[PDB]
Design an enzyme around this catalytic site. Structure first.
Site, PDB file in Angstrom:
ATOM      1  N   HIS A   1       0.824  -1.204   0.000  1.00 17.38           N
ATOM      2  CA  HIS A   1       0.000   0.000   0.000  1.00 17.38           C
ATOM      3  C   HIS A   1       0.862   1.259   0.000  1.00 17.38           C
ATOM      4  O   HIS A   1       1.918   1.315   0.636  1.00 17.38           O
ATOM      5  CB  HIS A   1      -1.066  -0.006   1.111  1.00 17.38           C
ATOM      6  CG  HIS A   1      -0.550   0.267   2.493  1.00 17.38           C
ATOM      7  ND1 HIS A   1      -0.522   1.531   3.045  1.00 17.38           N
ATOM      8  CD2 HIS A   1      -0.115  -0.577   3.461  1.00 17.38           C
ATOM      9  CE1 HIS A   1      -0.072   1.457   4.288  1.00 17.38           C
ATOM     10  NE2 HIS A   1       0.191   0.191   4.560  1.00 17.38           N
TER      11      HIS A   1
ATOM     12  N   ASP B   1       5.708   2.676   7.192  1.00 12.91           N
ATOM     13  CA  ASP B   1       4.369   2.153   6.934  1.00 12.91           C
ATOM     14  C   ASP B   1       3.670   3.096   5.959  1.00 12.91           C
ATOM     15  O   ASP B   1       3.027   4.054   6.382  1.00 12.91           O
ATOM     16  CB  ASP B   1       3.578   2.056   8.224  1.00 12.91           C
ATOM     17  CG  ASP B   1       2.242   1.420   8.010  1.00 12.91           C
ATOM     18  OD1 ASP B   1       1.374   1.623   8.884  1.00 12.91           O
ATOM     19  OD2 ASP B   1       2.061   0.722   6.973  1.00 12.91           O
TER      20      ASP B   1
ATOM     21  N   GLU C   1      -5.365   1.883   2.022  1.00 11.98           N
ATOM     22  CA  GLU C   1      -5.235   0.740   2.927  1.00 11.98           C
ATOM     23  C   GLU C   1      -5.537   1.163   4.358  1.00 11.98           C
ATOM     24  O   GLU C   1      -6.146   0.406   5.127  1.00 11.98           O
ATOM     25  CB  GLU C   1      -3.833   0.135   2.839  1.00 11.98           C
ATOM     26  CG  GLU C   1      -3.636  -1.121   3.678  1.00 11.98           C
ATOM     27  CD  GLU C   1      -3.352  -0.849   5.144  1.00 11.98           C
ATOM     28  OE1 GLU C   1      -2.981   0.288   5.499  1.00 11.98           O
ATOM     29  OE2 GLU C   1      -3.501  -1.795   5.949  1.00 11.98           O
ATOM     30  N   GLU C   2      -5.123   2.376   4.734  1.00 11.05           N
ATOM     31  CA  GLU C   2      -5.251   2.783   6.129  1.00 11.05           C
ATOM     32  C   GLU C   2      -6.687   3.107   6.509  1.00 11.05           C
ATOM     33  O   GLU C   2      -6.979   3.268   7.705  1.00 11.05           O
ATOM     34  CB  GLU C   2      -4.320   3.959   6.449  1.00 11.05           C
ATOM     35  CG  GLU C   2      -2.827   3.674   6.236  1.00 11.05           C
ATOM     36  CD  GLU C   2      -2.208   2.766   7.294  1.00 11.05           C
ATOM     37  OE1 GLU C   2      -2.931   2.154   8.110  1.00 11.05           O
ATOM     38  OE2 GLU C   2      -0.962   2.667   7.323  1.00 11.05           O
TER      39      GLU C   2
ATOM     40  N   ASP D   1       4.099  -5.029   3.608  1.00 14.76           N
ATOM     41  CA  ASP D   1       3.546  -3.912   4.384  1.00 14.76           C
ATOM     42  C   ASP D   1       4.366  -3.813   5.669  1.00 14.76           C
ATOM     43  O   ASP D   1       4.158  -4.597   6.609  1.00 14.76           O
ATOM     44  CB  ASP D   1       2.059  -4.144   4.673  1.00 14.76           C
ATOM     45  CG  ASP D   1       1.374  -2.961   5.388  1.00 14.76           C
ATOM     46  OD1 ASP D   1       2.039  -1.983   5.807  1.00 14.76           O
ATOM     47  OD2 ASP D   1       0.138  -3.032   5.518  1.00 14.76           O
TER      48      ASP D   1
ATOM     49  N   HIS E   1       2.276   4.789  12.763  1.00 15.46           N
ATOM     50  CA  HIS E   1       1.133   5.685  12.582  1.00 15.46           C
ATOM     51  C   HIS E   1       1.358   7.050  13.232  1.00 15.46           C
ATOM     52  O   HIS E   1       0.406   7.704  13.680  1.00 15.46           O
ATOM     53  CB  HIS E   1      -0.165   5.033  13.067  1.00 15.46           C
ATOM     54  CG  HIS E   1      -0.673   3.936  12.176  1.00 15.46           C
ATOM     55  ND1 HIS E   1      -1.897   3.341  12.383  1.00 15.46           N
ATOM     56  CD2 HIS E   1      -0.149   3.345  11.072  1.00 15.46           C
ATOM     57  CE1 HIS E   1      -2.100   2.417  11.461  1.00 15.46           C
ATOM     58  NE2 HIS E   1      -1.056   2.397  10.646  1.00 15.46           N
TER      59      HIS E   1
HETATM   60 ZN   LIG Z   1       0.822  -0.606   6.334  1.00 20.80          ZN
HETATM   61 ZN   LIG Z   2      -0.650   1.440   8.882  1.00 15.80          ZN
END
Ligand SMILES: [Zn+2]
Ligand SMILES: [Zn+2]
Ligand code: NA
Ligand code: NA
Ligand code: NA
Ligand SMILES: [Zn+2]
Ligand SMILES: [Zn+2]
EC number: 3.4.11.1
Length: 477
Positions: free
Chosen positions: A253, A265, A297-298, A326, A424
């Site tokens: 992603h 990420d 994706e998130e 990922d 994140h």
């Molecule tokens: Zn990810």
């Molecule tokens: Zn993530």
């Protein structure tokens, strides 16, 4: 030079030799620059994502690929501020944001004060609550009230949409309480597709119990978020060469969370896969290799799920294997391989997933590195491939979980700290990368992709022999 030769990039020990973490890092720096020029993130429905798409597309075009930028409808969700919740009747009580209650991801905003009405509750240890899962649960529900609903059985989205259809002004879902570990707050979502039109919050089990037994209770709930119907994109390309009926597909992603640049990420997987695609332009594969950079994706695997669900059945049958990458540069990494055979966690992927896992395991062993399994319970973009019966596997260096002492002995780093302490977060930038992990995981990505590009027999053999609580980061039920 040497890595432009088909004799290097076509074979499983040549491709990793040509794929250098230092070159992947140059691409990560480009993604970092993109984030810095676009408010510090690369999130779905932002210019930072569009600029990420542009970079991937241009890179692929320069390497000779035709590129498909595939749009899909997407409802963006952004929390604007903390929520509020207080009782007004029978007595004033202020509840605590992120302790007593939190938002359902993808909720609508609202400012609602109303009587609280419990719906089909089943309290206590061992319960099998179906609260709010059937429209009949809302028979005689007074329109305008706040529905107090217990987690259990069905998706939060279904509970909330059933409440909205009964005229609820807002929804409070409390944790199920069937076990001791299901009583607190959790990361929960009503889904990008939520259409209930009313605010939805999640509360602790004990709060739900007490509220359900408070006569005349009125709660004042405020949800401060924005949703916006828009679109986002997947980026797809494939080698001109190779059998189109036996596709080896790799995905990573390309979106970040809104909180930061998303370099580990999932810049790490996106950039490693892009370096591999550039190298594979000169390869002579037996099986066609397809590359996907997923959007959104998130927000709940929206892009990958859309891609798979919208393939014509004839086209879907041509995909023999899906490999997902990922998070493969975590500073405090472990060497995690998707547990496709269920050996660790009891969940098995579709036939062929065991063979894919075994290829990764054997490669790590050959390199003198240890590895171990990680869960495959629908946490990333393989989810809809899994749901569709397509063999899959992948690699992971770890996210917010805390490294164990045994893992520190195997992989180095620091026990008791997260594999990625910037998960994140604003600090998930260019410095949030371990290049040794990125090198080995990119090497293994290259080895297994190249192996399968020459023969899918290990997968085919398992296919012949053979005859959901989360969807991404958040729990859907
Ligand atoms: Zn990810
Ligand atoms: Zn993530
Ligand atoms: Na019921
Ligand atoms: Na949608
Ligand atoms: Na989440
Ligand atoms: Zn396993
Ligand atoms: Zn290497």
């Amino acid at each position: 030079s040497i890595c432009k030769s088909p004799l290097l990039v076509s074979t499983p020990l040549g491709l990793p030799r040509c794929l250098q973490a230092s070159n992947v890092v140059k691409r990560l720096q480009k993604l970092e620059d993109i984030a810095s020029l676009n408010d510090g993130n690369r999130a779905a429905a932002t210019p930072g994502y569009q600029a990420s798409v542009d970079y991937v597309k241009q890179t692929l075009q320069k390497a000779g690929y035709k590129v498909s930028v595939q749009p899909f409808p997407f409802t963006a969700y952004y929390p604007k501020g903390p929520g509020s919740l207080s009782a007004t009747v029978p007595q004033p009580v202020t509840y605590e944001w992120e302790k007593d209650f939190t938002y359902l991801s993808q909720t609508e905003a609202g400012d609602v004060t109303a009587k609280v009405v419990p719906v089909d509750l089943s309290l206590g240890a061992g319960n099998t609550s179906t609260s709010g899962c059937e429209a009949e649960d809302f028979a005689n529900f007074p329109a305008g009230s706040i529905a107090l609903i217990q987690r259990g059985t069905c998706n939060f989205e279904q509970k909330a949409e059933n409440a909205a259809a009964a005229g609820a002004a807002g929804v409070i879902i409390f944790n199920q309480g069937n076990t001791d570990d299901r009583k607190g707050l959790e990361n929960v979502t009503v889904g990008e597709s939520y259409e209930g039109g009313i605010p939805v919050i999640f509360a602790t089990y004990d709060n739900g119990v007490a509220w359900s037994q408070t006569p005349d209770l009125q709660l004042h709930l405020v949800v401060d978020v924005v949703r916006k119907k828009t679109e986002t994109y997947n980026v797809v390309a494939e080698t001109r060469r190779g059998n189109p009926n036996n596709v080896v597909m790799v995905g990573a992603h390309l979106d970040s969370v809104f909180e930061g640049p998303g370099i580990n990420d999932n810049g790490s997987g996106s950039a490693a896969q892009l370096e591999m695609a550039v190298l594979l332009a000169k390869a002579l594969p037996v099986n066609k290799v397809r590359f996907a950079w997923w959007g959104a994706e998130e927000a709940g695997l929206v892009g990958s799920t859309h891609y798979v669900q919208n393939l014509a059945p004839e086209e879907k049958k041509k995909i023999k294997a899906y490999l997902n990458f990922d998070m493969i540069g975590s500073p405090n990494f472990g060497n995690f391989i998707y547990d496709g055979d269920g050996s660790d966690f009891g969940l098995q992927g579709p036939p062929g997933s065991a063979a894919i896992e075994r290829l990764f395991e054997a490669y790590f062993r050959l390199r003198g590195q240890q590895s171990e399994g990680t869960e495959i319970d629908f946490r990333s973009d393989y989810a809809e491939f899994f749901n569709s019966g397509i063999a899959f596997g992948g690699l992971f260096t770890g996210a917010e979980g805390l490294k164990t002492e045994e893992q520190a002995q195997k992989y180095g780093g620091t026990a008791g700290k997260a594999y990625d302490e910037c998960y994140h977060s604003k600090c998930d930038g260019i410095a949030n990368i371990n290049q040794d992990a990125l090198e080995i995981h990119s090497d293994a990505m290259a080895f297994v992709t190249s192996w399968l590009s020459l023969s899918t027999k290990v997968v085919d053999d398992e296919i012949a022999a053979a005859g959901i609580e989360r969807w991404g980061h958040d729990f859907i039920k």
